[PDB]
Short mmCIF file of C-alpha atoms in Angstrom, two decimals:
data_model
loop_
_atom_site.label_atom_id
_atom_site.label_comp_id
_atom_site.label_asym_id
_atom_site.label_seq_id
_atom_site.Cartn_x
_atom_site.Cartn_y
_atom_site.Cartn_z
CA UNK H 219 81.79 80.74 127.52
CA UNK H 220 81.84 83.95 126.09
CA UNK H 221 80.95 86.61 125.24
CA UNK H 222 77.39 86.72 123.83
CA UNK H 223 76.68 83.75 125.72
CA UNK H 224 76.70 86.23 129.42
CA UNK H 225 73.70 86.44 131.03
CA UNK H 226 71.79 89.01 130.99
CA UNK H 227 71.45 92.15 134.14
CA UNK H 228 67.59 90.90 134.17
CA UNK H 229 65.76 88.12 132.51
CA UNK H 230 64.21 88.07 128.78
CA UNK H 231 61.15 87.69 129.86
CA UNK H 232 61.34 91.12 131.41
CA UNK H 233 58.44 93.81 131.49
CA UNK H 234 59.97 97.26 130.30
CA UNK H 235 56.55 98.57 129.28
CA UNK H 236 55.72 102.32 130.61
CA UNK H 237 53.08 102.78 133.27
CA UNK H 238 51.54 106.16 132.71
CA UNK H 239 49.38 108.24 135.39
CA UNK H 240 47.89 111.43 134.29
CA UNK H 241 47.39 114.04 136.44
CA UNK H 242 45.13 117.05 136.15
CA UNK H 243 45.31 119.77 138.72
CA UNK H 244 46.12 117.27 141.56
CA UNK H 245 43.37 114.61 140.88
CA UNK H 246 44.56 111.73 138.89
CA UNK H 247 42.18 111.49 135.56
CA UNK H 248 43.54 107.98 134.68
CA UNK H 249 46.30 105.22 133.79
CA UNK H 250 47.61 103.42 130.66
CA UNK H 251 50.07 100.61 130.01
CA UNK H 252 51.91 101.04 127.18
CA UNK H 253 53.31 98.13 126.03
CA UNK H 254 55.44 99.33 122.92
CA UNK H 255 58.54 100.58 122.82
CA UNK H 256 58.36 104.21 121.84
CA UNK H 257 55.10 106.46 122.07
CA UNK H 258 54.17 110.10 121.81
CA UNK H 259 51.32 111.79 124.11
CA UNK H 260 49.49 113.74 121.96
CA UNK H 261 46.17 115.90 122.75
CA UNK H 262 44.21 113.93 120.41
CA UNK H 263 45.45 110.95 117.85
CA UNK H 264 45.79 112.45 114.37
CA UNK H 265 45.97 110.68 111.22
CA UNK H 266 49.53 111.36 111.06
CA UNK H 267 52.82 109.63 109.95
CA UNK H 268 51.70 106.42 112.08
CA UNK H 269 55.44 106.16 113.26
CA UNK H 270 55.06 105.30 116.91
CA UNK H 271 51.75 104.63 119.04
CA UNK H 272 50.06 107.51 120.15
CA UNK H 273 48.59 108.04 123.89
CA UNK H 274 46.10 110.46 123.96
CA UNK H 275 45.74 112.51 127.48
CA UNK H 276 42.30 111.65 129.19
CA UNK H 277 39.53 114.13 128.19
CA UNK H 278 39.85 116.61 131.19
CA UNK H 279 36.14 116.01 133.10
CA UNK H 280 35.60 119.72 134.14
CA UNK H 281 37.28 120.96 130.66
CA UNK H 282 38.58 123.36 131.43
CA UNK H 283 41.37 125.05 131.97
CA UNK H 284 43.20 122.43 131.45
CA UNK H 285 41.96 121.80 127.86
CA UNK H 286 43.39 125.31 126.96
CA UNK H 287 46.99 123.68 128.02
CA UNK H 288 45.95 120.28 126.05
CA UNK H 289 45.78 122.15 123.42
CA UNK H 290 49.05 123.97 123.36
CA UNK H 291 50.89 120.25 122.86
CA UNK H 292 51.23 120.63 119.37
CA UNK H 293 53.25 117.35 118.76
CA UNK H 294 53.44 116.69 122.31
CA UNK H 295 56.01 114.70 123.94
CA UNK H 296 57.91 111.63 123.15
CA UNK H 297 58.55 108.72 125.48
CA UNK H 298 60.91 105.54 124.85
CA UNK H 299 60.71 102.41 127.88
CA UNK H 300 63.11 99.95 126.93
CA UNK H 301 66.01 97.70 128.51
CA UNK H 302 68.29 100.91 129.18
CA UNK H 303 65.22 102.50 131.05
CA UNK H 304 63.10 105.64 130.40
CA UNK H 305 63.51 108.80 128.10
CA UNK H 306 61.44 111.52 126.74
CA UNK H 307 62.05 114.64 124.51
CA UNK H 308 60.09 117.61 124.85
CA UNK H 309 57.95 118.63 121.23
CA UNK H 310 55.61 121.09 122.99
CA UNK H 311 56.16 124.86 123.79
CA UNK H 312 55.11 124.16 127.15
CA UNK H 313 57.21 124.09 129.98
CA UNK H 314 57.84 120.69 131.61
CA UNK H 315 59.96 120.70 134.67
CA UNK H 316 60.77 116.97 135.71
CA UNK H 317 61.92 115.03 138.88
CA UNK H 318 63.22 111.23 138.23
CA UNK H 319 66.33 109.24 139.40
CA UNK H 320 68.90 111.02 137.09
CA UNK H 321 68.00 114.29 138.00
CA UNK H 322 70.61 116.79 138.96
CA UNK H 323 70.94 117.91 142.58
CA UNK H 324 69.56 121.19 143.72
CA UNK H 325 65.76 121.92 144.28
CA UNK H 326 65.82 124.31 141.21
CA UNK H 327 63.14 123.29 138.11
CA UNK H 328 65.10 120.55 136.21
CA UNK H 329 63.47 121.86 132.51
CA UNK H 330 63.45 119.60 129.37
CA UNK H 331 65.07 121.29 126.95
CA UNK H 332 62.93 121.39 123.31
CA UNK H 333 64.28 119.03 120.39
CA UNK H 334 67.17 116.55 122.96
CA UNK H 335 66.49 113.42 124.49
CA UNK H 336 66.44 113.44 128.07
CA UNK H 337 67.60 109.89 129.68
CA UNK H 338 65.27 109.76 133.63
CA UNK H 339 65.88 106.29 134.50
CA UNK H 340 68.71 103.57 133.58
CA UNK H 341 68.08 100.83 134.40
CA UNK H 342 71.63 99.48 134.81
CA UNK H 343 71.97 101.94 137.93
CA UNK H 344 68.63 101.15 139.19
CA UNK H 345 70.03 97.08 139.14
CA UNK H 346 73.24 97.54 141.16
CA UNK H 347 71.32 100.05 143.66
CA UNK H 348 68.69 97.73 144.17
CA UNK H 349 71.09 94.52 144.68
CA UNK H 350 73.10 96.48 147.08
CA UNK H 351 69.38 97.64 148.96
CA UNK H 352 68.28 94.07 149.70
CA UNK H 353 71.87 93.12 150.74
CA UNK H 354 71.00 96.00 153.79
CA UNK H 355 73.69 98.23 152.40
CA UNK H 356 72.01 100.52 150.70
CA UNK H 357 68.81 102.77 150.42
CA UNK H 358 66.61 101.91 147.52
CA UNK H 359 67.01 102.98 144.59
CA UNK H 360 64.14 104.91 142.97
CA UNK H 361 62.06 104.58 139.43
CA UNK H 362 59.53 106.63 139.28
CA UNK H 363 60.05 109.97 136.60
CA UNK H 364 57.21 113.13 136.73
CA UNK H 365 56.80 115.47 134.24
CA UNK H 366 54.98 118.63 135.39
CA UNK H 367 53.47 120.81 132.70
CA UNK H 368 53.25 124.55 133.54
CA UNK H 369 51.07 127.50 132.42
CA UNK H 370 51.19 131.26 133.19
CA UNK H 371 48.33 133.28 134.56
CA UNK H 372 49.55 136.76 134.89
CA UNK H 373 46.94 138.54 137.15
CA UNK H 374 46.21 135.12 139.26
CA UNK H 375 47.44 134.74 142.48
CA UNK H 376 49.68 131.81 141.47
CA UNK H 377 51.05 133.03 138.30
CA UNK H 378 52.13 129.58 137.12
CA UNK H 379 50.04 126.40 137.73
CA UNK H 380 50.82 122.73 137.41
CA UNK H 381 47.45 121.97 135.86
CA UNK H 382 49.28 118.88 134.11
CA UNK H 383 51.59 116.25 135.27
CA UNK H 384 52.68 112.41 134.14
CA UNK H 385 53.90 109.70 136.25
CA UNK H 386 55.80 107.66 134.37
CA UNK H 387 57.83 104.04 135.97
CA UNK H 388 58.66 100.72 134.07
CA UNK H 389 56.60 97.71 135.63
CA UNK H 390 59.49 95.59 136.28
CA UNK H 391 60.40 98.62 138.82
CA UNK H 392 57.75 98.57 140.39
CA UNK H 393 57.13 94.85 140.80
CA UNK H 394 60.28 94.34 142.50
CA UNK H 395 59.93 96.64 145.03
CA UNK H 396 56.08 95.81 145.91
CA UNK H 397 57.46 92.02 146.48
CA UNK H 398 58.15 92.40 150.46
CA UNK H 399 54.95 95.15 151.39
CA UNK H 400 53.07 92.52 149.42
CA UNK H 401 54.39 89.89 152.19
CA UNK H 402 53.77 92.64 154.70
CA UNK H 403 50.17 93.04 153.10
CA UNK H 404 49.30 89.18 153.39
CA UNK H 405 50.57 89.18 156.96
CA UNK H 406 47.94 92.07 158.12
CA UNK H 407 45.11 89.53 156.97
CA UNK M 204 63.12 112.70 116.98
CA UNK M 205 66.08 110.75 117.75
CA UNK M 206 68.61 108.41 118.74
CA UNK M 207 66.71 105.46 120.80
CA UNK M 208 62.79 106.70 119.37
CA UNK M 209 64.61 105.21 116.25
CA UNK M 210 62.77 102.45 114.46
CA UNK M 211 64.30 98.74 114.50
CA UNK M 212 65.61 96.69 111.30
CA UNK M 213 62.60 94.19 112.60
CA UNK M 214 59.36 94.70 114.50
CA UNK M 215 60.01 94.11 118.84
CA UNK M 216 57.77 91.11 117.94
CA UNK M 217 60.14 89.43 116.12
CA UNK M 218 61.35 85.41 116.37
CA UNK M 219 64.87 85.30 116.84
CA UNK M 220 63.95 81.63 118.10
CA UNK M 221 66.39 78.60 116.89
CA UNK M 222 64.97 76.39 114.65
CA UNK M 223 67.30 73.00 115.24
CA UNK M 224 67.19 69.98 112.91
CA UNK M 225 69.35 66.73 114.17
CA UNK M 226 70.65 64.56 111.16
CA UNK M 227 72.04 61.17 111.82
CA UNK M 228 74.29 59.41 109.10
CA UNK M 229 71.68 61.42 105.98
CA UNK M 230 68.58 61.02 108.08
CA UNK M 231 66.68 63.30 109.83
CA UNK M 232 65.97 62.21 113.28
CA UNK M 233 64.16 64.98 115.15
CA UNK M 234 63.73 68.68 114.97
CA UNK M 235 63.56 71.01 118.08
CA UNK M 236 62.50 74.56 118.39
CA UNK M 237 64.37 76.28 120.77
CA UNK M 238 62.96 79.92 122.39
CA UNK M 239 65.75 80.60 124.64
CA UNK M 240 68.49 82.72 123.95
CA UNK M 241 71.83 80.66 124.63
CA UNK M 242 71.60 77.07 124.94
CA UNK M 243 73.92 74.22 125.41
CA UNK M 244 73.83 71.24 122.65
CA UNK M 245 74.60 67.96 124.89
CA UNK M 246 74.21 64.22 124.81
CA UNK M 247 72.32 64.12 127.50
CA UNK M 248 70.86 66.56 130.97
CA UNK M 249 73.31 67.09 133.64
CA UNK M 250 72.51 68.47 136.98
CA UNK M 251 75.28 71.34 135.74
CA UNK M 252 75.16 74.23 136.73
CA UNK M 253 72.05 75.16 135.24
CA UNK M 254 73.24 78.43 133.70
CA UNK M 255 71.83 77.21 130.14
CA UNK M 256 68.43 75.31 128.56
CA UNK M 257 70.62 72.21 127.97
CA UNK M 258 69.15 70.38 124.46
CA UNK M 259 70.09 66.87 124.27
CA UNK M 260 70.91 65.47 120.83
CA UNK M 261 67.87 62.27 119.96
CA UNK M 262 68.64 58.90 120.89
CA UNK M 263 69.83 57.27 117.75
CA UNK M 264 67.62 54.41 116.65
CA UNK M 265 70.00 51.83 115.20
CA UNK M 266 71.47 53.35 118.36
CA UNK M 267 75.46 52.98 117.20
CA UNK M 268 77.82 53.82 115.54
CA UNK M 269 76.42 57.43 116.13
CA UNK M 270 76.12 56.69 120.27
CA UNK M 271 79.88 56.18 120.48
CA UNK M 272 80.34 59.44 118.91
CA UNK M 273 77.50 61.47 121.22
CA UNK M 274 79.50 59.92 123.79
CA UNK M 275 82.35 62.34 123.11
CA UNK M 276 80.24 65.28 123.16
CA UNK M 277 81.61 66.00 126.90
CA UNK M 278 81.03 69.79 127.17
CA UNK M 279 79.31 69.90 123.49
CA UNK M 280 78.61 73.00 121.44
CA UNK M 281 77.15 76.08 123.08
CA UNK M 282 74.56 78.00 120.93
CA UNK M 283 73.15 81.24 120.70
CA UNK M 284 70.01 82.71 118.77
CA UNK M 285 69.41 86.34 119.23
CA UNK M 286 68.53 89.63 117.45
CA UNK M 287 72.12 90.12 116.19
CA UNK M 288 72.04 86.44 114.52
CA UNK M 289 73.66 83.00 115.38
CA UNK M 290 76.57 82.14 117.25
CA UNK M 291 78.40 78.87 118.12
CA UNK M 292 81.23 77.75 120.33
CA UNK M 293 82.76 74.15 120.42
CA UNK M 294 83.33 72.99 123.80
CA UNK M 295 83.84 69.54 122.30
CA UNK M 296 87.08 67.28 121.28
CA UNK M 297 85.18 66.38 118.28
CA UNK M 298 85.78 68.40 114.80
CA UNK M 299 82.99 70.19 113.14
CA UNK M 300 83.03 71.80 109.95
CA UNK M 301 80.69 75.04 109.31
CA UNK M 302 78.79 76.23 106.12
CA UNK M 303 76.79 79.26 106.91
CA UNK M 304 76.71 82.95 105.42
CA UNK M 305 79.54 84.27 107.16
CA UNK M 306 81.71 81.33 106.01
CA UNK M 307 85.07 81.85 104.11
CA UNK M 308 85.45 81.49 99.98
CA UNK M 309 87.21 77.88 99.11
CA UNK M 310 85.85 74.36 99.36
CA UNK M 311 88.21 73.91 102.13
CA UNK M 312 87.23 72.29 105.50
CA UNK M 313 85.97 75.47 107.94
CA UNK M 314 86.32 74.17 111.19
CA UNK M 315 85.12 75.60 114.36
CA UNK M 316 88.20 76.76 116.78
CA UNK M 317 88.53 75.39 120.19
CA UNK M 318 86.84 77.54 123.08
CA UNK M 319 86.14 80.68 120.73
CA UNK M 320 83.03 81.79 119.69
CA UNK M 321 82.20 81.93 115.67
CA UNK M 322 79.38 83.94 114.11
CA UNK M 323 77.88 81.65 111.81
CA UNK M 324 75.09 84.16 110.57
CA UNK M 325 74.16 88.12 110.63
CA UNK M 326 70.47 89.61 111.17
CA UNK M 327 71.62 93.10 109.90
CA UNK M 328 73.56 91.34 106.40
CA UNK M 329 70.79 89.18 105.93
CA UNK M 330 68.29 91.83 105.97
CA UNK M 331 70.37 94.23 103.79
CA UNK M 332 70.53 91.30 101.23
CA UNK M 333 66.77 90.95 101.78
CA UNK M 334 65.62 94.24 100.82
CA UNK M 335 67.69 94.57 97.61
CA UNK M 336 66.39 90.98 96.50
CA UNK M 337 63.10 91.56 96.65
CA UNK M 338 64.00 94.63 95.13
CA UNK M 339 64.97 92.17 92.05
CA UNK M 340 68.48 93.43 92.08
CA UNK M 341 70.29 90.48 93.95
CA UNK M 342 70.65 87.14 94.83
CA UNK M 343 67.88 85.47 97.71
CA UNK M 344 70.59 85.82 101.02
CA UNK M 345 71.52 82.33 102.76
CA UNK M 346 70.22 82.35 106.40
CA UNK M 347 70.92 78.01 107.32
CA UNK M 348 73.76 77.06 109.19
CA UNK M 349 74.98 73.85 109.64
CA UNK M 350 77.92 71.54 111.72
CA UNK M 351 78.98 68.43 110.58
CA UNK M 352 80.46 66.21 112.91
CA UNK M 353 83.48 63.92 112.07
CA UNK M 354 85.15 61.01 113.74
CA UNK M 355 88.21 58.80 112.59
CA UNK M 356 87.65 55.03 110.79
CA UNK M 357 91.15 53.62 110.13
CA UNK M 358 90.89 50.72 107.98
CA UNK M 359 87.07 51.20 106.76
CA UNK M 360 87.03 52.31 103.00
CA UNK M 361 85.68 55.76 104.77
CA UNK M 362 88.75 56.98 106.83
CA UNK M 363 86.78 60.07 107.67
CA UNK M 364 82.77 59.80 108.43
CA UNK M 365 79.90 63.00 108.77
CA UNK M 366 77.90 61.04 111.38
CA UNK M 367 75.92 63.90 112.56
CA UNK M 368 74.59 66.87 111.09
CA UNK M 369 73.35 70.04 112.94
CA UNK M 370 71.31 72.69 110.96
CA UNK M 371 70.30 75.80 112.30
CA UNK M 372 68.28 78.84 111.59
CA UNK M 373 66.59 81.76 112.80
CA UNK M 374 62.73 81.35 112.35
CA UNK M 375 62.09 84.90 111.30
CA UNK M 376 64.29 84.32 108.81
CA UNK M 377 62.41 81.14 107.14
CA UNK M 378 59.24 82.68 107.51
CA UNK M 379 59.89 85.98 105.36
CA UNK M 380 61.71 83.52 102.21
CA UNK M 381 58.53 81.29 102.59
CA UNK M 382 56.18 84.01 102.03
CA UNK M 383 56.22 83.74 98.14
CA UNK M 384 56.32 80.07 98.26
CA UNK M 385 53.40 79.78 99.95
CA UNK M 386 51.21 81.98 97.81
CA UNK M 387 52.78 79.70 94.68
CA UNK M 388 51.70 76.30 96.74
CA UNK M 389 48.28 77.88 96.87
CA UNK M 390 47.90 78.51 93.70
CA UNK M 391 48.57 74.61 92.92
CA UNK M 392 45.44 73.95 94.64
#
């Protein structure tokens, strides 16, 4: 019984779509489930190629300054959430400096470099940690990736700001590990 | 913009189910629509182990001679149905004899080997084959598969009888060489 007849490290009925939080200047402006497999966040959607889906950052409320960063995207960023877990590859000028599961150690800014595909989550890792967590020998694994968007103000007091930043996790992630404080929840009522 | 933001041979949305159609001794008896990926052709539902949809073959009407041969199914025929194509592995002492895409040139009998697993049909060949037929430069590509059975008559004036008939396909694959036919049938009416 062998070999494409294995099972598979999670079942086919399996949520892999991307969970997005924006984030302007520390107050989160909104959330979007993506549900295909690919996207690219984009300022605004343009006519464009029509390759992939584009997510459009939330109009920021007080406009500004973040809008003058919005609008440096140019093409923006592309993400892929699928079975092997999360990527993204930088389009913009902008810096983004991310923290995620595959990061390397140090505290130093982990930077995307432009044009190359970045791999933040596997999911294959994120499997075995996560069996070996519930079996008590282990600490749980983690899911969640953030990109943080960056911007220079000579003459400011903080000479680079964060005024953007994504949250980005794959609901199956997410579910699993909200299964016992959703127990723990129930219990409290 | 590359490798995994890469566009599939087929939309995500696509039906890799298994269309099954059950043929006793030239009739039809039953067709069955199966959405999981593996399953496990069987004469009838075990307790088992459970590690596979189990499909049992119909109950044949005249009920025999086909019952005495269901009744050597044992094991049976493990299937699977999946984005690469379709797959089959005979668990049974019974022969069966393939035609399918991927079979060999001659008339000859293609049997399927003990305990090894035989692709019967390719997603990526088919859809090659697709594209340069409708194209008008080739021939429409197969995409059915089907076993025939056999069991032993010494002394009948048939030594060797086809009792049961399995055909198979991919429903993606029936849908997108139906799409012309259809418009023709509506333009008989």
């Amino acid at each position: 019984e062998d070999p494409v007849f294995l099972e598979h490290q999670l079942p086919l009925n399996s949520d892999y779509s991307l969970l997005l939080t924006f984030i302007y200047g520390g107050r989160v402006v909104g959330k979007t489930q993506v549900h295909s497999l690919d996207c690219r966040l984009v300022a605004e959607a343009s006519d464009s190629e029509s390759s992939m889906e584009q997510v459009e950052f939330p109009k920021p409320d007080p406009l500004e300054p973040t809008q003058h960063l919005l609008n440096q995207l140019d093409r923006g960023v592309l993400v892929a959430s699928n079975s092997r877990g999360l990527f993204v590859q930088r389009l913009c000028p902008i810096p983004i400096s991310w923290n995620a599961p595959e990061a390397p150690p140090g505290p130093g800014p982990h930077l995307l470099p432009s044009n190359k595909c970045v791999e933040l989550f596997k999911t294959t890792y994120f499997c075995r940690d996560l069996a070996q967590y519930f079996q008590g020998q282990g600490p749980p694994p983690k899911f969640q990736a953030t990109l943080h968007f960056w911007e220079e103000s000579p003459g400011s007091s903080h000479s680079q700001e964060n005024l953007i930043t994504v949250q980005m996790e794959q609901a199956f992630a997410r579910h699993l590990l909200e299964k016992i404080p959703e127990e723990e929840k129930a219990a409290l009522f």
